[PDB]
Ligand binder design. Sequence first.
Ligand SMILES: O=C(NC[C@@]1(O)CCCN(c2cc(NCc3ccccc3)ncn2)C1)c1ccc(CN2CC3(CCC3)C2)cc1
Lengths: 201, 239
Amino acid sequence: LFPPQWICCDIRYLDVSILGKFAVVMADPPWDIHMELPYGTLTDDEMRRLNIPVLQDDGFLFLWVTGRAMELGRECLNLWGYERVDEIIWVKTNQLQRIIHWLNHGKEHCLVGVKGNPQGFNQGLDCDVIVAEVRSTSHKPDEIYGMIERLSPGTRKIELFGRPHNVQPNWITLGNQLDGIHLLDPDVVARFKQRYPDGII
Amino acid sequence: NDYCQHFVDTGHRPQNFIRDELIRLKDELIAKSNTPPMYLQADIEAFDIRELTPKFDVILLEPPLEEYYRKCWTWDDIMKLEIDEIAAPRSFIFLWCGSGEGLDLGRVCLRKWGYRRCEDICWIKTNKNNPKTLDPKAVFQRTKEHCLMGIKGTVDIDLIITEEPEIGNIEKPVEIFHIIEHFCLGRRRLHLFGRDSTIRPGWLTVGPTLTNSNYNAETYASYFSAPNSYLTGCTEEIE
Ligand SMILES: O=C(NC[C@@]1(O)CCCN(c2cc(NCc3ccccc3)ncn2)C1)c1ccc(CN2CC3(CCC3)C2)cc1
């Protein structure tokens, strides 16, 4: 079912096995980056324990990292059975196209992991650098949905820890600030009713 | 506007459209502090590294990766360098990693020699004068290189934007040297796998392609014998 679908929930406690298999996973996790928390973080083990492996057989993972998650996400990405094979960086500008620890950070990183043997993907259409204006805080740029669409058009994609502005055709967004459950793929609806008959997770 | 679409349309990498004294005295202070440039031709695979003394405050490691050439060093060879043995207790490393496996293997090395990564510096290459062949595993076109910065012990952005060099030019942007030097990390600075073209005041270059050498460990350690042992490289020389 092509249009947006989403699930408000806690990706720790949601049984993601009901959602089937995806050509692309994208995740923007709240890593404990040993700094002060303006949101609830997940612990490193909670990160490791996430049931990412059930979501795919062959396809691509997109994983936003920062600080020490640059190393830790490489750990999670490997543990979950992905090989890192690319790494996008987003250059943060303003409205006039100028850029926004030890150095000032002008970018955010997004590891690209692969799993299995994906086929029929349009590798090499985009390049690994994004230039796009910073909107809200913690706000990924829409441009990444275009690159993911060109890479694997028409296919099922799933986003973890998305926010409500992230809900796109062909995607299922999981996040704890979405507005309840909205599901249209009947196979998904079926398994959801079967596993959550009373509606609560 | 969507520069990822524009690149799919036209071949112009998104970075092409990034736009755009006070810190100038700190440049004179670096230059006044810089030791005479020192250089040593050495075949680092076959060269016992310990011969390079004293321990270094900053090491800039620029091994010749096969991915640069579209004698090369594999990450197998780089890892077996005994970098830990020539690095000062508190000291820094800047490791060029390319854009492939190195982004991972270079982190293994940083941990293997006992550094924690504190900074991931990206060289983003514009193609304004030529709107590429891919690595099998590659998913996107690779338009940047990573220089990883590691610390062991107790003004500038993490980006360098320049135009993609001529095919077969393997030089890294000199800007890396400004970023490093503006950190004021000490004066014992080592550039492993430099070239004639990378020799520079305030640095010791060591590499196989150097055509001349002038290194002398005793002469070298004299630039740092008291009262200069602990300078930052960003202060006035002591009278
Ligand atoms: O966390 C964050 N934003 C709060 C959320 O609310 C948002 C909505 C979805 N979202 C959960 C979180 C969840 N568990 C968390 C939890 C743990 C204990 C107690 C309560 C909640 N489960 C289900 N969705 C977390 C967060 C994560 C990453 C980044 C950094 N990147 C953002 C970045 C991409 C480009 C710029 C880089 C910035 C902010």
